[PDB]
Amino acid sequence: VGSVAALLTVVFYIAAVMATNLYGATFPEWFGDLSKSLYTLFQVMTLESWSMGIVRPVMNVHPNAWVFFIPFIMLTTFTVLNLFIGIIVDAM
Amino acid sequence: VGSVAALLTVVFYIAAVMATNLYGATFPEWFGDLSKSLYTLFQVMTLESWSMGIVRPVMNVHPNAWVFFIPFIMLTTFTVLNLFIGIIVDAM
Amino acid sequence: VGSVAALLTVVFYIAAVMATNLYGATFPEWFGDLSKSLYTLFQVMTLESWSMGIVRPVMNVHPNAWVFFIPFIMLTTFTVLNLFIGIIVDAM
Amino acid sequence: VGSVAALLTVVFYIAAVMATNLYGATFPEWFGDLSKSLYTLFQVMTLESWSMGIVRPVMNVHPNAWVFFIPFIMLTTFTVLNLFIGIIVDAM
Ligand code: NA
Ligand code: NA
Ligand code: NA
Ligand code: NA
Ligand code: NA
Numbered sequence: 220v221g222s223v224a225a226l227l228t229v230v231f232y233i234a235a236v237m238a239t240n241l242y243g244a245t246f247p248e249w250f251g252d253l254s255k256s257l258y259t260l261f262q263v264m265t266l267e268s269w270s271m272g273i274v275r276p277v278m279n280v281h282p283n284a285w286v287f288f289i290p291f292i293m294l295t296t297f298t299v300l301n302l303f304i305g306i307i308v309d310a311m
Numbered sequence: 312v313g314s315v316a317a318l319l320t321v322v323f324y325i326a327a328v329m330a331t332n333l334y335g336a337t338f339p340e341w342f343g344d345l346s347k348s349l350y351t352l353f354q355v356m357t358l359e360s361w362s363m364g365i366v367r368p369v370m371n372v373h374p375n376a377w378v379f380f381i382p383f384i385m386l387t388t389f390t391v392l393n394l395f396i397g398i399i400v401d402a403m
Numbered sequence: 404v405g406s407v408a409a410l411l412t413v414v415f416y417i418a419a420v421m422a423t424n425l426y427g428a429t430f431p432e433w434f435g436d437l438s439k440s441l442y443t444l445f446q447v448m449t450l451e452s453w454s455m456g457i458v459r460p461v462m463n464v465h466p467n468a469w470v471f472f473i474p475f476i477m478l479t480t481f482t483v484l485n486l487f488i489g490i491i492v493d494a495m
Numbered sequence: 496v497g498s499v500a501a502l503l504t505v506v507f508y509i510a511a512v513m514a515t516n517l518y519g520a521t522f523p524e525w526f527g528d529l530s531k532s533l534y535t536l537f538q539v540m541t542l543e544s545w546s547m548g549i550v551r552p553v554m555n556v557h558p559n560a561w562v563f564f565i566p567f568i569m570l571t572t573f574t575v576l577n578l579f580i581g582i583i584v585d586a587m
Contacts, residue, residue, distance in 0.1 A: 258377055262362040265384065270538040271548045272363045285534055292541070300579055303392055350469055354454040357476070364455045395484055442561055446546040449568065456547045487576055 220309055223302045227295065234291055235260055241287065245280045249273060263288065264295045312401055315394045319387065326383055327352055333379065337372045341365060355380065356387045404493055407486045411479065418475055419444055425471065429464045433457060447472065448479045496585055499578045503571065510567055511536055517563065521556045525549060539564065540571045 235256035242250040249259045263269045269292065277284045327348035334342040342348045355361045361384065369376045419440035426434040433443045447453045453476065461468045511532035518526040526532045539545045545568065553560045 258381075261381065265358050265361065266541050266543055267358055267361050268363040269541065269543050270534075271544040289534075289537065297579060297582075301583060303389060304583060306389075307393055307396060350454075350473075353473065357450050357453065359450055359453050360455040395481060398481075399485060399488060442565075445565065449542050449545065451542055451545050452547040487573060490573075491577055491580060 220302065220305045223298065223305055227298050227302065230294065230298070231257065231260060234287075237287065242277055242281065242284070246277055249277075260291065260295075263292065264299065266292075266296070312394065312397045315390065315397055319390050319394065322386065322390070323349065323352060326379075329379065334369055334373065334376070338369055341369075352383065352387075355384065356391065358384075358388070404486065404489045407482065407489055411482050411486065414478065414482070415441065415444060418471075421471065426461055426465065426468070430461055433461075444475065444479075447476065448483065450476075450480070496578065496581045499574065499581055503574050503578065506570065506574070507533065507536060510563075513563065518553055518557065518560070522553055525553075536567065536571075539568065540575065542568075542572070 235253055238250045238256045238260060239253050243252070243256075248255070250256045259273065263273060269288070274284060274288050277288075327345055330342045330348045330352060331345050335344070335348075340347065341351045351365065355365060361380070366376060366380050369380075419437055422434045422440045422444060423437050427436070427440075432439070434440045443457065447457060453472070458468060458472050461472075511529055514526045514532045514536060515529050519528070519532075524531065525535045535549065539549060545564070550560060550564050553564075
């Protein structure tokens with residue numbers, strides 16, 4: 220559980236650094252600084268307006284944006300699901 | 312199961328009192344009274360428009376709003392997942 | 404599994420009859436006929452725009468609409484979760 | 496696990512070919528080519544704006560669109576849930 224929660228924190232920090240760098244200048248409200256980025260990636264992780272609200276507008280400037288966001292979702296939504304199950308199993 | 316469902320009710324009532332107090336005057340449709348608050352926090356819990364629809368507009372007035380909402384989500388979405396699993400395990 | 408899937412079909416049909424009757428005349432695009440109702444309740448079940456898109460607009464006419472929709476969500480989202488888990492357990 | 500992930504890839508490719516053909520000319524931003532289709536169906540699978548954002552606008556042109564999209568959701572959202580559970584079980 221401890222290693223999974225740490226893996227997620229490292230993945231969240233690398234992705235938020237990458238997103239700040241990639242989409243900060245073109246999309247500043249969403250990825251203008253590491254903090255705006257970390258908040259956005261969390262929203263993307265919960266699946267809230269990920270495509271209509273974030274990814275589709277980003278793609279009109281960066282057509283390949285899906286290469287970053289889709290894997291991010293596939294990885295984080297899996298890790299979170301694994302972490303939540305891991306806590307319950309250990310609690311029993 | 313009984314203790315988990317009671318923990319959630321107490322957490323939902325404390326958060327809806329806190330939200331009424333914090334964002335009631337600035338965002339009255341969403342947190343103007345305990346009832347509007349309880350309904351909103353449920354919507355936030357289901358993840359429906361949590362960021363684009365509620366949290367981002369709230370943040371333009373209260374920049375730290377994420378300190379309240381993100382933990383609320385992390386706690387309630389975990390407890391609900393734990394409660395739903397708990398019912399099935401006991402049913403077997 | 405068979406009894407759970409049948410319970411859900413009966414619950415979906417009763418709710419879609421109730422919604423047609425309650426919100427059909429005031430909200431015809433969403434609940435104007437049993438079929439429009441069944442499609443909407445499915446959208447509500449998946450959690451897609453349930454509050455911002457459906458429930459909040461319905462509440463401006465019917466303030467208690469939450470007494471119908473919130474329990475519907477709590478019941479159907481639990482039954483579906485139970486049904487999906489039930490299929491996997493039986494498959495092993 | 497390997498057979499489930501392969502089943503999903505085949506289902507995603509058949510559906511994205513079908514959607515290109517069915518709704519490409521009438522809805523080109525969403526289904527104009529196999530790639531736009533694959534990206535959209537993924538968004539539909541995550542449940543993000545599936546009805547308000549995609550299915551309801553598509554239905555104003557193609558009233559039966561629900562015969563394609565609802566089963567697609569029921570199948571893919573089940574397979575993904577089964578695949579994610581399958582990985583954890585094998586990991587133990
Ligand atoms: Na959801
Ligand atoms: Na939404
Ligand atoms: Na959603
Ligand atoms: Na979701
Ligand atoms: Na949405």
